[PDB]
């Protein structure tokens with residue numbers, strides 16, 4: 001019957017861009033005959049304000065009742081004095097990932113044609129282009145490893161976190177990266193610190209075990225400090241980057257920033273049953289919230305990931321992706337995608353949503 | 365009496381650039397009346413070839429007998445099939461740091477005037493320039509934390525590393541970063557992942573404790589994934605970056621690469637008694653080794669750090685730094701610092717050393 005989506009728009013620009021994601025989703029529901037019901041739940045800063053914590057029980061319950069979470073962005077100044085550890089971002093995202101076993105984070109980042117000038121890369125490097133998919137392991141490693149805590153007092157007070165990975169955890173994320181490379185340019189670069197970390201020694205070992213099932217995919221390994229340098233220099237040489245939790249956190253963000261267009265980038269965090277949480281790569285931009293300035297493309301393309309990965313609605317997902325493409329090549333750019341002197345052509349959040357939804361309707 | 369230096373040139377370009385470091389050191393020894401004796405010991409790949417391990421006992425003993433280690437670079441293809449964990453780089457550097465308690469790594473990276481085109485930053489960002497000093501904690505955190513290892517077999521085989529920090533470890537590195545900021549632009553950005561890690565929660569806490577002694581230095585905190593993005597975008601806004609072991613590894617390398625000129629960058633790793641190990645930021649470049657191509661400036665400026673920090677010879681250290689400056693502004697550039705069409709003006713490793721040593725002699 002009807003798919004059920006828990007909508008967790010969160011803070012800042014989350015609600016206004018989500019409104020555009022929902023608009024485009026309505027055009028897709030009509031075009032493809034999907035029956036999707038949505039329920040909205042507070043999360044993040046709005047949840048602390050409304051319910052006293054960033055992830056209320058009723059929100060958590062609504063995500064359990066759903067086929068996917070369509071997630072906005074969480075965080076901002078108002079809760080920044082809370083300890084970084086009662087704070088809304090980690091307090092929303094980490095238990096959602098842990099609870100639903102969302103072990104796989106997919107962050108596709110590409111330099112779009114015509115938007116190279118916006119990348120912070122030197123012009124000859126951005127002109128080459130890139131398209132890197134970061135596959136990051138999201139539920140193990142040092143984020144969730146135990147023991148974590150502190151003991152002692154005074155100078156000798158000590159804090160500890162444990163990075164742990166099992167062969168099973170590593171091989172499930174590696175297979176995702178290999179399967180994804182098969183569909184792309186047939187290369188996985190696995191990113192670790194095997195010269196220092198026991199977890200990375202096992203990581204590199206297990207990814208090489210997984211590789212035997214993918215004779216058509218090239219595998220290379222690289223150290224995280226070297227990967228961060230090489231992305232600056234030659235990001236066009238990477239296809240799929242495969243990382244543990246902490247390394248993928250850093251590298252996916254680095255690659256996103258190298259596009260210079262984070263308002264175009266979306267993220268899927270999924271479990272093995274196909275449930276996921278789909279969100280823009282960027283933050284809640286509380287400075288521009290409520291102004292019709294924010295670029296809703298990242299949230300619209302998060303809707304498209306949700307349709308593909310959780311709802312198994314490939315044609316609907318790709319129709320949204322084509323409508324975004326059409327916007328970007330038909331002069332429908334928001335302010336942050338425009339060179340400072342073309343800024344007077346900017347479209348508002350609503351104009352972008354209207355255009356992209358209308359494109360879907362026109363059969364793009 | 366005489367200072368004693370253990371010279372560990374290592375592999376690849378290490379010996380040929382070290383030869384230039386020693387040449388420039390001779391000019392400084394004559395100019396300032398320093399009596400410095402040097403003994404050379406195998407380390408890294410040459411040590412595995414000559415002695416069966418990357419850090420022979422006799423090499424370790426020679427560093428104990430010395431006032432500092434002048435270190436080249438270690439590693440390359442020939443030992444790359446060894447497990448990344450019997451490998452020469454980690455096998456030289458990690459026990460040297462552990463043994464001598466070299467808790468403080470100083471990596472100054474700046475965009476030199478006239479070399480902005482080489483930075484992989486977009487031209488308007490590199491034109492702004494930057495000068496970022498990375499202060500990285502080198503002997504704790506996850507590199508040396510216990511337990512480290514693996515247990516189990518098959519799917520459930522698991523590996524673990526423990527990130528640990530005590531208040532004492534954090535406050536000693538933080539004071540270095542604050543003292544260094546006082547001398548520079550009076551800002552420390554401490555880099556952690558306090559939204560996830562118990563170690564980073566204590567890190568951020570303790571750095572804020574240390575800050576009370578530095579009312580003139582501004583402190584800001586930033587998450588490592590956000591620091592990696594922001595360095596790409598606005599590296600001119602950072603002065604001193606203060607990081608734990610694993611975060612400083614990644615960020616110092618990222619900043620080095622953003623200069624586009626790694627052959628200019630040097631590194632000091634020091635203990636609280638002033639003993640240190642001084643090395644170029646870049647690797648052993650085995651592809652260009654033995655050709656008089658390699659830029660010896662990084663190794664010469666490592667000699668200058670050694671004179672300042674271990675030998676308390678400030679005037680000699682700054683005379684070398686001025687001689688490098690003179691080379692860079694008097695057309696003495698090696699090949700990798702020249703745009704592809706100016707490449708015919710390149711100087712060889714020896715011409716650079718001769719020039720820089722002669723400048724010191726001329727009283728630069």
Ligand SMILES: CC(C)[C@H](C(=O)O)[C@@H](O)C(=O)O
Pocket residue numbers: 089090093094249559560589
């Ligand atoms: C909020 C934080 C815990 C989170 C992470 O580290 O995973 C965020 O940085 C992200 O990338 O989603």
Ligand SMILES: CC(C)[C@H](C(=O)O)[C@@H](O)C(=O)O
Pocket residue numbers: 195196225453454457458613
């Ligand atoms: C060789 C490796 C262990 C080392 C590190 O991680 O510290 C290197 O990357 C460095 O920066 O010196």
Ligand SMILES: [Ca+2]
Pocket residue numbers: 249250253589
């Ligand atoms: Ca992140």
Ligand SMILES: [Ca+2]
Pocket residue numbers: 225613614617
């Ligand atoms: Ca490094």
Ligand SMILES: [Cl-]
Pocket residue numbers: 140141142143163244245246247
């Ligand atoms: Cl991890």
Ligand SMILES: [Cl-]
Pocket residue numbers: 504505506507527608609610611
């Ligand atoms: Cl660490």
